[model samples]
Target: FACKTANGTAIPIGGGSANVYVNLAPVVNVGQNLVVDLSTQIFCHNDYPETITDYVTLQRGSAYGGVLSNFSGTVKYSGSSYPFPTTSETPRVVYNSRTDKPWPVALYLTPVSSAGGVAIKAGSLIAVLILRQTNNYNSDDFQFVWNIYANNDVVVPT
Candidate 1:
């Protein structure tokens, strides 16, 4: 079977044991803070016997500039909103950990300068998230395009 590619990167959008999906909010502001949860948005099947651990990396989409770090936020897992293992890498969401429970992950884009810098220009920002599983190396990329404005009252893209 063949796979689909975006900007030379293959997106795992087919039927497979390690399939995954991500859904996000339609829009956000440069200084906005919110969660991009995949609890009800993800679907995965591990045909193997062993348990699988999934990790996700959020990057700037091909159509956008800067990087995930540029968005300047911290990611957390579960509703408790526990801090990420570290701020260096993307948040790793463990699926089926509680026996098929919904693992809701949230991202807190702080309301300060270091967290959400003014460098984060207002425009249509694309969040390209890639999901990868262990052993089988099953992977796929998910994308979310958000409208970023300079301020809440600003109606035009910057």
Candidate 2:
């Protein structure tokens, strides 16, 4: 997992396991995209048991709709569009916009069969999260962190 500027500059993510975070906030506006590159050794049933599968999310308030908006999720390599996680790379990524979960930005994969093979273990790109800071955002609410929860991370599939 990594973060980058829209113009293609490297950004660092710290805090390892439970409290993942970006040490310094990237200067972004309400309309630009925070490009989060995804990679991982996601679990797949073909090999073993799995829930977190290969998934990721930005931690947002349970109902912080007023604080942010306009989220987008899609495959970075497959050329798939919105409501994605398609093209069945080795594993099937079922990525949808943050609005689907209501508040936090979430993305995932289902590794069950051939279509569900884990793709990120090889360090390949699976998805690009477009977390757009919207008009409702304020400087005080600008901390970026991974939403380590039941479905995103801690809920490991393998």
Candidate 3:
């Protein structure tokens, strides 16, 4: 009834140029630094959505991809090509951790824009959060996933 694996000579998952990735521990702290590795793909999302500008807030929760943090959906990155997209089927990979004391964390992301839609500047420091070890207003643990996108409305038509 089900199947998995791609063992047919070679399964090439191609398309898209550059991409965004949030492969970090769900529970990070002040001393901890989570680096979102960008990619260098050919047909990544940033290709089509040109001259497009948008914004994203950041949040953390225990849902599938965690809920939005009080800070909520802070813009991670912006540019012409965009943060990046996955060449594989798993474009937005989720990661989290907990030890009976806490639950899995994830990021809530959405798009916002100015009068005219446009993409944020590439390599620009869109957002940076110095998470503290503990926060009275927000949770210490955070959940995040690559909310990759092109312009604002272009869906890649996949």
lDDT leader? 1
Model 1, range 1-158, lDDT digits (tens) per residue?
A: 11222113222434222223233333445566644444454433333325544443332212124324445455555434433323333444444332334434444543333433343343434233333333325554443222222211112123
TM-score of each: 0.38, 0.23, 0.20
Candidate 3 segments whose C-alpha is farther than 4 A from its true place: 1-107, 113-116, 134-158
List pairs with backbone clashes in candidate 2.
50-157, 50-158, 51-157, 52-157, 85-93, 90-117, 91-116, 91-117
Candidate 2: list runs displaced more than 4 Å.
Answer: 1-25, 40-78, 83-158
Better model by lDDT, 1 or 3?
1
lDDT of 2 by residue, 80-141 (tens): 23334333322223332321222222242222222111212222222333322211222321
Per-residue error for 146 in candidate 3, Å, reads: 16
lDDT of 3 by residue, 1-158 (tens): 00011111111112111223233323323222222223221111111123322111222111111211111231222221122111111112111112111111222233222212222222222232211122223333322232232222211110
Error of 3 at 16 (Å): 35
Residue 155, model 1: Cα distance from true site in angstroms: 7.5
State model 1's lDDT.
0.36
Model 2 C-alpha lDDT versus the unseen true structure: 0.26
Among these predicted structures, which one has the highest TM-score? 1
* Ordered list by TM-score, greatest first: 1, 2, 3
Residue 89 displacement in candidate 2 (angstroms): 14
